[PDB]
Design a protein around this ligand. Structure first.
Ligand code: SF4
Ligand code: SF4
Ligand code: SF4
Ligand code: SF4
Ligand code: FES
Ligand SMILES: [Ca+2]
Lengths: 586, 905, 208
């Protein structure tokens, strides 16, 4: 049985436990290609099911995702409860290495759900986004305000009747009254944000213009002297509407938009989308495709980690390793330009493979990079990372344990510095990552800034090892799958065969027809766990594209970890998270 | 009937075959050679499924779903491995000889063969040998021929010969060298040959008029509209790119014009793309032509209309109901004149009285095909109402259909049906002044003057029912033919009488009404069909008003010092000299039109109105069904200087500026509500289409497909800044792809058919409730009137027989599908298909005049001598001269008139 | 071949007219000296929006060394900055911020749109993106790309320097003409059409 087959997952022990606890008629099991058990739970039993999953012998401890779906235009809803809207909750049990997707059906008029924040604190931002984009009200939320769009915005963007394009709307006119009105909206008021204010609590504004490579955003700070008593991040300043474009572009033409989700990730961002689309299409890619995609993912991972370490060192105060790390990034960029033809957004992965074959001479450039990198990395450590001033700025700053990382959905180096060995490449292997010998570094139990930075250095070394294994063992074979839905087909057969020309003609003009199904793929990105949840209605466009990013979780974890610290501690914590605002807002 | 497809139970119709039943359930089976309108032949061998004998069967056998009835307790599998492999093998065999032609093929992105190649999953070529080739033929100005792309599915020959009744297209040759086309290079002679561009699943037959300015299907802005080239009212999908009307596609209407249009509607759209059309309001000041925008045009027109003592409005049957009503409100009901002549108006009002007061049901265009005997009186149906002629051909083949039904042969097995009913056919009796195109299937044809055709109808009605007035002076041969017609009509369960106003005789319509009443009095299920002239002739007749002659006398007597002519050239309904003199006498002439007419030189103000491609409105077809047509594109999107509005918008803004000195344009639903409130006879036009607030789950209806391209580059030469998307406040459609075009959406107006995996015109199968039936949530359009409880009385005005008087020549009307329509002659692609202007003469009349065939003779009508070449019409009765109506210089009101000093030039 | 702009506080709040070039020989030499000093020391505002800013700070690093043009000081204050590089998407929440920062800059100031987003909105023809930064602030140089490579940013820096080197501004705010005169220079497309059309052969994409 192939890995893309539709499964109901009735053999999962959680399904039997829920049968024994709530009864057989309490919920509906849905067979999907997501790989997870999808259970349609009634709305009034949602908190009971959440408590039961949180109190299992091996509990479901992390709310991976929480969002909504407009089911009004969905025609192929066979075997599903009647719904105008739906809210889905993706929950991960790490001890079982399993996960479950609860779904709550909602009518168009009664768009209210009990809030999930009493079980998982990341439901705050997740439900704020679900209210902002779908209009679904969550009863009991401490503050249900818009998180992506401004407060003076009419309508909910992710509804199916909301027009997507800016050309549908009037063109942007900036008048004096409009500038004054929008400048009034961006002003901060203590009472509206739930600050809950002593005649000394001053207020500090950080953004929204940001002198750093990772986006533009605001943090409003409540200060007692220099101590941060409370803070709430202001996001949505980098909102690009990428999921609405997922509903607006075809399966093949959406890949450049998948590139700019985490713009330091590139092919790492392309990987889960093409894997989920191949799950929708029933495509198993050959081994050469898997090794090529692993090689490019590790190259872009080293690029992102180099930028992150350089930016952290610059934010500490040493400004020379950013120059040297960008030189190493230029070496990586030389190899990436040779392979794909572009630097930061290659858009080179395809449904069924990659756009081209590897060019002649890729092994030479990979050899130069593999010889160049480790001495430069050792010089980085000895020059800046072992500096005691940097250690004093970094060690013990904004520290949290395993419980705080689990309850806030923090993944990547922040989770693994708490001692939790959870990498997607080893727990739920994808794209032939089980054929590569590499280790997953873990921390002692405390997630300092310094511990996260040293962990990312360790994953840079492990990615260099994976790149060496890719260089030594690259199979000879096709760079594209032989499936009929491989988009586009191989170019020369398109250029001399009429049936291949027909397939290419219809795949690049109207789009390839994915059969109506739901698919899901989570990967270990450069900054944590990045996932694509794709709902297809049988058309050539995605019915729903849900992109889960870890930077959302880390920016939400900021107020819990930086509370009671200094402003410079906040700057160091921002520099040591490895986020980008495109990942947060997307 | 109960079928089991892939283990799932379905309830279907046992009279259907498995292919149409499975397509009606939403299942996907590839097919080429089967068409819903043409039946099953089992040629392409593409629709193969695996049938099992019982439920506990594993082997099965490959059967063909188009050739297998969907009987009760059937067990089939589509996704069986052997069936899938065979369908992929059939696609592969079709792909062995196919040219590498998709980029340079007009069917690309709209191709059924592309969709079925992708659907079967065939994308790897292992055939390594040569491909057969074919030379192409010249098939005329409308159809482009490319025989390399053929897959030998026999759809073209089956449609063209069995369905359309054409003769000049056929299949030639042998084993793998089958050729589909004409026996020699020449123009395709069928009036419905343009449907080959949608019948052919490949790019062998293509729209050459579209192939000139070609663009792909995904790049088209589509709208649901009504064809304006005659009175039948076929539903069309006009598609536009870069500000010009690119194509006309057949929009499915199961009640009217299901799969097929005629050539005049499909290729006569070229007047919209003319460069001489008015695009801005122009005011004449001496020898100067000042171009204004809409506001100062309304201000100036309001001042000149207010200074006038009496304003009159001349409408047209070309314009919509809303525009004629807006003109009628602007000038007043008593000052509103229909733009047609007095005789035309009398014939049209008599036809309306027969339709909505005669107590006899008027069938729809699809319902015509279910009648058992057809009598056509006076109307050349193929040249005036061509789709009615196609439906008449289907009704004629109904006898072979019922003969095969009597032998327990299924209705989709068309080859056995045609084999059983070899040449037996339902009775068809056509009357005209000469030969018609229905003569090949007619049981009888009467070539006689209009008085003699009317007398034949009156004699038929008297012989059917003796209470009808009798005719004295019937010859024994004519009496025998009348007895044959009466014996055929009396024995028919569903007789149909087809007449119209194009014959130019009131007595023909009276005779047809008498025949219909006599057949109704015997208890038969008689239907009557009246063929009008223009698209909204019935609506203009229902709205009413004075004739054009009364308006001309009002202009000539000086009682009216201001005339507003709405979309009327005025030369087709009256003599040109009289119209020109009456318009030159009036101190204010305002012409609201979308075409450069001849009366615009004398016009003081010209309002650049919109055509059907740039306007919304309602038109009433020949059966009294109100139908809403929607705007295709914004004219001012590309050319920002273009001020071209709807005619009702122009006139309503003019009325508001005349009353209150302020400019309010309208919304369309306001005009619809005003029509319903003021005219109770036109109260049904509100329910023709839903209003502008109609939404499908909150979103509007998309005019263009979801993969529409070039949005940031279509206007980049004018300005790199992307303009505002055109807003449509009038209707529920949007000028964008951000809308709904789902096949399961609860609506009746479909701009275009597209489904995932179905890019061809076969997506209409996805848009129907059952394949070949109606639209899923009802066809658009509503009948304005029901059948009356009681009928009319017998028309006792039996005309005298035609007497050929010396020195006077009765003008026998001749109509041409390419040339008689006012707007279709303006289309430049028609001039190659438009015939030369001749005049028809009897052999006896030509011998008396001493003229041969081809020589030029000159005749004077209303003091205007014009010369024409001569053909010898054998079937034309002596004492008559045959003129082609609607031509250049020959107005359609000349039908039934008389001619003086017709002599050789 | 010049355009005259004067400002007086919809955006932008300026009106431009095509005017003949006015250009004593000492005043002209002083004008060239002022233009030389302005174009050889251009301090960009360190403004981070999106991935194009990552390419801009790549241009600032060692392998590229934008410091060679004297454009490296990279002020965090708009008062001390000469050039606004809109290197990223003009989000609707960020557009009043961009307008406020541009208003807080001081004369002379120049604007470079970096990337397709800043040029026209790029691929993001979506509800929450302003379609180009020239909708509300005037732009001097445009860089197509998504992202432009760092040497494309340097090429736009050279284009801006050549545009500054032949523009006319008042030397003092008490003497002379106070309107700003900008050169209507030949487009780079028409200048490079001679060398671009004549290109015949390119290396095949199967090699390094
Ligand atoms: S007919 Fe269809 S398959 Fe053949 S060349 Fe044209 S688009 Fe391609
Ligand atoms: S020309 Fe077209 S319709 Fe005719 S047999 Fe060939 S593919 Fe079929
Ligand atoms: S029959 Fe009449 S309405 Fe129908 S397509 Fe032809 S011209 Fe148009
Ligand atoms: S143009 Fe491209 S690279 Fe630049 S900000 Fe926009 S998405 Fe990023
Ligand atoms: S469709 Fe049945 S064999 Fe052709
Ligand atoms: Ca309109």
């Amino acid at each position: 049985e192939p890995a893309w087959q539709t499964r109901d997952h009735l053999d999962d022990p959680v399904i039997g436990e829920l049968r024994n606890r709530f009864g057989p008629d309490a919920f509906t099991v849905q067979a999907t290609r997501t790989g997870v058990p999808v259970v349609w739970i009634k709305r009034e039993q949602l908190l009971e099911v959440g408590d039961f999953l949180k109190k299992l012998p091996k509990p479901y401890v992390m709310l991976f995702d929480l969002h909504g779906m407009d089911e009004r235009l969905r025609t192929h809803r066979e075997g599903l409860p009647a719904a105008d809207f739906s809210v889905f909750y993706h929950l991960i049990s790490i001890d079982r290495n399993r996960d479950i997707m609860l779904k709550v059906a909602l009518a168009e008029n009664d768009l209210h759900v009990p809030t999930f924040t009493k079980l998982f604190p990341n439901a705050n931002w997740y439900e704020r986004e679900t209210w902002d984009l779908f209009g679904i009200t969550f009863d009991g939320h401490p503050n249900l305000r818009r998180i992506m769009m401004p407060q003076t915005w009419k309508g909910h963007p992710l509804r199916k009747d909301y027009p997507a394009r800016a050309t549908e709307f009037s063109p942007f006119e900036l008048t004096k009254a409009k500038q004054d009105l929008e400048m009034e909206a961006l002003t901060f008021k203590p009472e509206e944000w739930g600050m809950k204010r002593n005649e000394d609590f001053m207020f500090l504004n950080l953004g929204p213009n940001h002198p750093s490579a990772h986006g533009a955003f605001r943090i409003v700070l409540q200060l007692d002297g220099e101590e941060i008593v409370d803070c709430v991040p202001d996001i949505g300043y980098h909102h690009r509407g990428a999921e609405k474009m997922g509903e607006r572009q075809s399966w093949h033409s959406y890949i450049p938009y998948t590139d700019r989700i985490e713009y330091l990730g590139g092919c790492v961002n392309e990987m889960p989308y093409v894997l989920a689309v191949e799950k929708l299409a029933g495509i198993t890619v050959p081994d050469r495709v898997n090794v090529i995609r692993v090689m490019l993912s590790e190259l872009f991972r080293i690029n992102s980690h180099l930028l992150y370490i350089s930016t952290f060192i610059q934010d500490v105060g040493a400004m020379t390793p950013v120059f040297f790390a960008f030189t190493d990034r230029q070496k990586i960029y030389d190899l990436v330009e040779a392979i794909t033809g572009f630097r930061m957004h290659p858009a080179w992965f395809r449904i069924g493979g990659v756009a081209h074959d590897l060019p002649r001479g890729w092994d030479r450039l990979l050899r130069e990079f593999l010889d160049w990198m480790p001495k430069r990395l050792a010089s980085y450590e000895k020059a800046a990372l072992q500096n005691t001033i940097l250690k004093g700025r970094s060690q013990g700053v904004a520290a949290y344990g395993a419980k705080e990382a689990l309850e806030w959905g923090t993944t990547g180096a922040g989770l693994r510095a708490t001692g939790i060995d959870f990498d997607v490449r080893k727990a739920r292997p994808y794209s032939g990552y089980e054929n590569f010998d590499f280790e997953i570094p873990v921390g002692g139990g405390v997630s300092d800034c310094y511990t996260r930075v040293m962990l990312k250095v360790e994953e840079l070394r492990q990615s260099l090892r994976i790149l060496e294994q890719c260089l030594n063992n690259m199979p000879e074979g096709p760079f594209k799958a032989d499936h009929p839905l491989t988009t586009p087909p191989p170019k020369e057969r398109t250029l001399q065969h009429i049936e291949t020309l027909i397939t290419h003609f219809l795949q690049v003009s109207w789009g390839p027809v994915m059969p109506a199904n739901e698919s899901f793929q989570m990967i270990e990105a450069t900054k944590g766990i990045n996932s694509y949840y794709l709902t297809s209605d049988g058309s050539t466009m995605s019915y729903r594209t849900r992109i889960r990013t870890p930077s959302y979780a880390h920016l939400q974890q900021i107020p819990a970890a930086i509370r009671g610290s200094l402003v410079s501690d906040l700057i160091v914590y921002l520099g040591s998270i490895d986020f980008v605002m495109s990942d947060v807002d997307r | 009937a109960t079928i089991h497809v892939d283990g799932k139970e379905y309830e279907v119709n046992g009279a259907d075959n498995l292919l149409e039943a499975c397509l009606s359930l939403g299942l996907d089976i590839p097919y080429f050679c089967w068409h819903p309108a043409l039946g099953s032949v089992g040629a392409c061998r593409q629709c193969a499924v695996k049938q099992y004998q019982n439920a506990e069967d594993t082997r099965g056998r490959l059967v063909m779903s188009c050739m297998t009835p969907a009987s009760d307790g059937t067990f089939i599998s589509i996704d069986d491995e052997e069936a899938k492999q065979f369908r992929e093998s059939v696609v592969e065999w079709l792909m062995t000889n196919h040219p590498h032609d998709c980029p340079v093929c007009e069917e690309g992105g709209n191709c059924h063969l592309q969709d079925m190649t992708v659907m079967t999953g065939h994308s790897f070529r292992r055939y390594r040998f040569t491909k057969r080739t074919h030379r192409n033929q010249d098939l005329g100005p409308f159809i482009s021929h490319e025989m390399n792309r053929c897959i030998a599915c026999y759809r073209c020959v089956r449609y063209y010969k069995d369905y359309a009744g054409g003769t000049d297209l056929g299949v030639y040759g042998a084993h793998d060298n089958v050729y589909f086309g004409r026996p020699e290079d020449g123009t395709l002679e069928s009036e419905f040959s343009g449907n080959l561009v949608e019948i052919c699943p490949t790019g062998v037959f293509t729209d050459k008029t579209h192939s000139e300015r070609y663009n792909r299907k995904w790049d088209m802005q589509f709208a649901p509209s009504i064809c304006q080239q005659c009175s039948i009212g076929c539903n069309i999908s006009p598609g536009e790119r870069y500000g010009e009307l690119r194509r006309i596609e057949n929009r499915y209407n199961g009640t009217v014009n299901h799969y097929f249009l005629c050539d005049r509607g499909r290729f006569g759209y070229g007047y919209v793309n003319l460069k001489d059309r008015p695009r801005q309001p122009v005011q004449r000041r001496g020898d100067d032509f000042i171009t204004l925008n809409a506001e100062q045009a309304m201000q100036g027109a309001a001042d000149i209309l207010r200074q006038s003592k009496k304003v009159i409005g001349i409408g047209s049957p070309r314009a919509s109901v809303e525009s004629n009503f807006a003109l009628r409100e602007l000038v007043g009901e008593e000052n509103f004149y229909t733009g047609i002549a007095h005789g035309e108006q009398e014939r049209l009002q008599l036809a309306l009285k027969v339709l909505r007061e005669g107590g006899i049901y008027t069938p729809a265009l699809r319902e015509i095909e279910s009648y058992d005997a057809v009598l056509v009186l006076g109307e050349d149906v193929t040249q005036t109402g061509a789709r009615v002629a196609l439906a008449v051909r289907q009704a004629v083949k109904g006898k072979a259909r019922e003969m095969a039904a009597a032998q327990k042969v299924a209705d989709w097995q068309i080859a056995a049906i045609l084999n059983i009913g070899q040449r037996a056919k339902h009775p068809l009796f056509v009357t005209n002044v000469d030969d018609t195109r229905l003569d090949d299937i007619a049981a009888w044809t009467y070539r006689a003057p209009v008085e003699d055709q009317a007398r034949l109808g009156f004699a038929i009605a008297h012989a059917l029912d003796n209470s009808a007035p009798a005719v004295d002076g019937i010859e024994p041969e004519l009496q025998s033919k009348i007895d044959v017609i009466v014996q055929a009509l009396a024995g028919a369960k569903k007789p149909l009488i087809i007449s119209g106003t194009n014959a130019g005789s009131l007595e023909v319509i009276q005779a047809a009404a008498n025949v219909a009443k006599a057949l109704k009095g015997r208890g038969a299920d008689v239907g009557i069909t009246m063929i009008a002239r223009s698209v909204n002739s019935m609506g203009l007749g229902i709205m009413g008003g004075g004739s054009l002659e009364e308006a001309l006398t009002e202009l000539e007597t000086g009682r009216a010092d201001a005339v507003v002519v709405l979309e009327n050239d005025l030369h087709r309904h009256a003599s040109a000299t009289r119209v020109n003199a009456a318009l030159a006498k009036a101190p204010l002439v305002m012409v609201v039109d979308h075409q450069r007419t001849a009366i615009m030189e004398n016009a003081h103000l010209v309002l650049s109105a919109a055509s059907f491609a740039e306007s919304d409105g309602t038109v009433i077809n020949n059966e009294g069904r109100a139908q809403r047509f929607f705007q295709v594109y914004d004219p001012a999107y590309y050319d920002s200087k273009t001020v071209m509005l709807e005619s009702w918008r122009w006139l309503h803004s003019l009325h508001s500026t005349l009353l209150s000195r302020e400019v309010d344009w309208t919304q369309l639903d306001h005009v619809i509500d005003a029509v319903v409130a003021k005219i109770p006879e036109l109260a049904g036009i509100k329910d023709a289409a839903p209003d502008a607030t109609f939404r499908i789950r909150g979103q509007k209806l998309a005019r263009e497909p979801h993969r529409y391209s070039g949005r940031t580059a279509m206007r980049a030469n004018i300005s790199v800044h992307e303009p505002r998307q055109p807003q449509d406040i009038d209707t529920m459609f949007t000028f964008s792809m951000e809308g709904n075009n789902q096949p399961t959406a609860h609506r009746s107006q479909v701009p275009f058919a597209w489904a995932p995996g179905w890019n061809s015109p076969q997506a209409w199968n996805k848009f129907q409730d059952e394949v070949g039936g109606k639209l899923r949530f009802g066809d658009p359009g509503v009948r304005l009137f029901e059948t009356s409880e009681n009928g009319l009385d017998y028309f006792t005005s039996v005309p005298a027989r035609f007497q050929p008087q010396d020195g006077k020549w009765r003008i026998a009307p001749y109509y041409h599908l390419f040339g008689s329509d006012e707007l279709s002659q303006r289309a430049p692609v028609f001039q190659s298909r438009m015939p030369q202007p001749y005049i028809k003469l009897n052999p006896a009349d030509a011998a008396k005049l001493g003229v041969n065939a081809g020589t030029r003779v000159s005749f004077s009508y209303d003091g205007n001598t014009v010369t024409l070449p001569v053909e010898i019409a054998e079937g034309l009765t002596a004492g008559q001269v045959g003129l082609p109506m609607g031509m250049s210089g020959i107005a359609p009101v000349l039908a039934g008139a008389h001619l003086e000093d017709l002599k050789e030039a | 071949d010049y355009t005259l702009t004067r400002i007086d506080p919809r955006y932008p709040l300026q009106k431009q007219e095509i005017v003949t070039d006015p250009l004593n020989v000492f005043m002209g030499k002083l004008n060239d000296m002022v233009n030389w000093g302005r174009k050889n020391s251009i301090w960009p505002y360190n403004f981070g929006l999106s991935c194009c800013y990552v390419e801009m700070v790549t241009s600032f690093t060692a392998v590229h060394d934008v410091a060679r043009f004297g454009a490296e000081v990279l002020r965090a204050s708009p008062r001390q900055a000469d050039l606004m590089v809109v290197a990223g998407t003009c989000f609707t929440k960020m557009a009043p911020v961009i307008q406020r920062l541009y208003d807080q800059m001081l004369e002379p100031k120049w604007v470079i749109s970096m990337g397709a987003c800043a040029n026209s909105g790029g691929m993001y023809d979506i509800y929450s993106v302003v379609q180009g930064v020239d909708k509300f602030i005037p732009v001097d140089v445009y860089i197509p790309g998504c992202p432009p490579r760092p040497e494309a940013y340097m090429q736009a820096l050279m284009l801006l320097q050549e545009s500054i080197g032949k523009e006319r501004r008042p030397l003092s705010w008490v003497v002379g003409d106070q309107g700003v005169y900008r050169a209507n220079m030949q487009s780079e497309r028409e200048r490079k059409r001679g060398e671009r059309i004549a290109v015949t052969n390119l290396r095949t994409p199967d090699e390094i």
